[PDB]
Design a protein around this ligand. Structure first.
Ligand SMILES: O=CC[C@H](O)/N=C(/CC(=O)O)C(=O)O
Ligand code: SF4
Ligand SMILES: [Cl-]
Length: 299
C-alpha cells in the first residue's frame, strides 16, 4: 500500500496539517507539513489556518497545540505517544513547592501535563529556558520537571533553582555518559559535540554547543562535522537539512519509544476516523494558556 499518497489526499480533503517533532521517524518527517522543536511547534500552532491539526509527537505536545487552538480539532495518532519525563511531575509536587516557597514563581518545562501547567506561572522549552528565567524578577525559581535542564538554567542564570521533583529526568538523554564523549572524540577527533541540555551535567560540560534540537539546527553552520548527543532521529533531520555536512549519533540506542509510537499507518488511520481527539478541560486549559502565552511573549 502507498500510505503516503493516501495520507496526503486525506489530509488535504479534511483541511488538516501535520506537525511533527524532530524525533519522529524518517517516513513521518517526510510527509510532515512542518518540523521543529517544541518551541517552534508551539509558535507554529499560533498561525494554523487549517481546521484540523494532526500532531506527530507526544501527548504534551498535542495538548499544547490544543490549548493554543481550542476551536480546532487536534488529533494524536496514538494515545501511547507519551513523554516519560513529563509524567514524573505531579500536581502535589508543585503544591508542596509553592507551600515551601510562596514567593517563588513556578516555571515548568513544556514537557509537562496540562494539569501541571495550570499551576505554572510560565512555561519554558530547551531553547528559551535560560532567557525566560533570567527575565524573572525573583532570584529563587521553582523549576521542573527535568533535573538536568534545571542544572543548565542555574548555571546560565545565577538563580536559585528548586527542582520539582527531585529525580525528574529523561531516560533517553541520560543514556549518554562520559565514556560516549571520550569515544566520540576518539572515533571523530575533528568533530565537534552538540549536546542537549537534558543530558547529565558532566556530559553537558564536554559540549561544544548546548542547545535544543532547534538550536542544533541554527548553529550547525559553525562546523562541518558534528557528533549529536540527543535522540536518534534528530541525526536524520540534520543529515537531510545539511547534505554536505557530517553528523554522527553518539549512541545508536538513544531512541524515544513514545515518539516512535507514531507511525505512518496510524497517521492514516488518524485522518480516516478523526482520532484521537485531544481535549483539555476548560479550567485546566485556561490556566495553562496564560503560562504558555507568557512564555511566547517573554521569548
Ligand atoms: O525549544 C524546544 C525544544 C523542547 O523544549 N524540547 C526538546 C527535547 C524534548 O523534550 O523532547 C527539543 O530539543 O526538541
Ligand atoms: S525524549 Fe525524553 S523528553 Fe523528549 S519525549 Fe521522549 S522522553 Fe519525553
Ligand atoms: Cl496552517
Amino acid at each position: 500500500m502507498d500510505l503516503v499518497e493516501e495520507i496526503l489526499r486525506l489530509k488535504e480533503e479534511r483541511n488538516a496539517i501535520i506537525l511533527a517533532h524532530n524525533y519522529q521517524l524518517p517516513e513521518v518527517q517526510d510527509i510532515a507539513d512542518f518540523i521543529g522543536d517544541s518551541l517552534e511547534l508551539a509558535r507554529r500552532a499560533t498561525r494554523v489556518d487549517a481546521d484540523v491539526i494532526v500532531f506527530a509527537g507526544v501527548d504534551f505536545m498535542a495538548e499544547t497545540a490544543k490549548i493554543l487552538n481550542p476551536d480546532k480539532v487536534v488529533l494524536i495518532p496514538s494515545r501511547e505517544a507519551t513523554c516519560a519525563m513529563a509524567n514524573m511531575l505531579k500536581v502535589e509536587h508543585i503544591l508542596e513547592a509553592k507551600r515551601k516557597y510562596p514567593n517563588a514563581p513556578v516555571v515548568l518545562y513544556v514537557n509537562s501535563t496540562a494539569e501541571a501547567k495550570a499551576y505554572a506561572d510560565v512555561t519554558v522549552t530547551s531553547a528559551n529556558a535560560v532567557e525566560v528565567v533570567k527575565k524573572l524578577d525573583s532570584d529563587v525559581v521553582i523549576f521542573g520537571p527535568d533535573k538536568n535542564l534545571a542544572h543548565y538554567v542555574a548555571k546560565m542564570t545565577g538563580k536559585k533553582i528548586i527542582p520539582v521533583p527531585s529525580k525528574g529526568h529523561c531516560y533517553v538523554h541520560q543514556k549518554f555518559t562520559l565514556d560516549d564523549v571520550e569515544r566520540a572524540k576518539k572515533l571523530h577527533p575533528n568533530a565537534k559535540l552538540m549536546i542537549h541540555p537534558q543530558c547529565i551535567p558532566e556530559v553537558q560540560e564536554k559540549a561544544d554547543i548546548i542547545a535544543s534540537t532547534g538550536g542544533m539546527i541554527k548553529r550547525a553552520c559553525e562546523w562541518d562535522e558534528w557528533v549529536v548527543f540527543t535522540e536518534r532521529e534528530m541525526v536524520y533531520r540534520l543529515r537531510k537539512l545539511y547534505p554536505q555536512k557530517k553528523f554522527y549519533p553518539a549512541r545508536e540506542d538513544a531512541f524515544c519509544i513514545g515518539m516512535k509510537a507514531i507511525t505512518l499507518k496510524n497517521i492514516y488511520e488518524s485522518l480516516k476516523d478523526m482520532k484521537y481527539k485531544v481535549e483539555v478541560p476548560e479550567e485546566i486549559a485556561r490556566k495553562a494558556r496564560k503560562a504558555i502565552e507568557r512564555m511566547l511573549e517573554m521569548s
